[PDB]
Amino acid sequence: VGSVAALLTVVFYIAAVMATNLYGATFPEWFGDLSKSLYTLFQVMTLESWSMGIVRPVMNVHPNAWVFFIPFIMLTTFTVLNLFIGIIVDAM
Amino acid sequence: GVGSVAALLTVVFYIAAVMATNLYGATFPEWFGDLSKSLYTLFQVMTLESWSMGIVRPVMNVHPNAWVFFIPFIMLTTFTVLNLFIGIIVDAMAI
Amino acid sequence: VGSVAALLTVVFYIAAVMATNLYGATFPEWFGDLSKSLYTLFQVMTLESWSMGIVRPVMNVHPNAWVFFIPFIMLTTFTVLNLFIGIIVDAM
Amino acid sequence: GVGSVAALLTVVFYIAAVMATNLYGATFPEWFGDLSKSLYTLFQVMTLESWSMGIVRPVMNVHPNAWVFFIPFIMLTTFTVLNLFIGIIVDAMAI
Ligand SMILES: CCCCCCCCCC(=O)N(CCO)C[C@@H](O)[C@@H](O)[C@@H](O)[C@@H](O)CO
Ligand SMILES: CCCCCCCCCC(=O)N(CCO)C[C@@H](O)[C@@H](O)[C@@H](O)[C@@H](O)CO
Ligand code: NA
Ligand code: NA
Ligand code: NA
Fold it and tell me: Where would you find the membrane-spanning parts of this chain (chains B, D) (predicted)?
């Protein structure tokens, strides 16, 4: 549980560092600085406008942007679910 | 204890809707103008429908730290709702 | 499980009958006929644009529309989750 | 059997993306123009992001029965994904 939350924080910072670098100059409102990146990736993780709102606009400049976001969604959504289940299981 | 979980959620929902009415009511009246409008918006935000693009990003354009309220709200309420729904299903199977 | 799926089908038809009647004349693209209603309520159940896309526009004509949709979401989302868990538990 | 579940999902994803490319490719080329565009749209539809307002409702304006493909697709894939993720967590706890 504590290790799961630690893994998620590491992945969140590494991904937000990568995203700032990859799409920061082209998409500054969403990935302009580490803070803007951490906010966008949290939004993308919850799945709110991930494609129509973020990825489809991003792919119009970077056609492979899906190689970053789709694996990010698969990894973080599974981890978040696994973490929440882990909290409930340990408390019981 | 299921009933206590639902009670905790109702308290958190009213406290948050009181806080939100005060924080964003004057600037964003269609969404947080009164306690009722606030309770509706926070239910929407809790389900995750247009939470960012639709609500938080427009709210952050006036209040840049609005994320300090909404992100912890989402983390707390979504976990509690999940925990509550699991608790109902687990207790009904045992009984 | 079979009874859960049966309860959901009854609730889906009753709600789509109610919705056709309540918002059919005012919102015909979404609730014009039982079919359009069953499609909208399935969308609302999955939570896609339930508020900004459907309920907020509907509330502008019917200010209490939330008394129908919010309890509908609470009932159907819980039942769907309970049904899917029930399938997985019975198969194991 | 986890590995078989992931295998079933991949088969369903390719079959559905083949079917969708054929059905809506000429009418909706930005979303279903090629197998790649189709696999991306169906992943989006599977996560439920703008599935109706963004994709299906525009698609139904040309193909009124499009719901016969997408609604069963959502029911099948979302259940399988949930079942797969639960299967991973259950097997890791047992081992
Ligand atoms: C799961 C973990 C998710 C963490 C999410 C962190 C979000 C941080 C967002 C943020 O702070 N900003 C980007 C907004 O998108 C910047 C501004 O809103 C504002 O904070 C600044 O101007 C200054 O106040 C900094 O001191
Ligand atoms: C969980 C259960 C969810 C059931 C969902 C059922 C959706 C039915 C939607 C539907 O069929 N239509 C509304 C579209 O919103 C009508 C048209 O698309 C079209 O079917 C008709 O014109 C004729 O073909 C009828 O024979
Ligand atoms: Na969702
Ligand atoms: Na959603
Ligand atoms: Na949306």
Answer: 1-16, 66-90
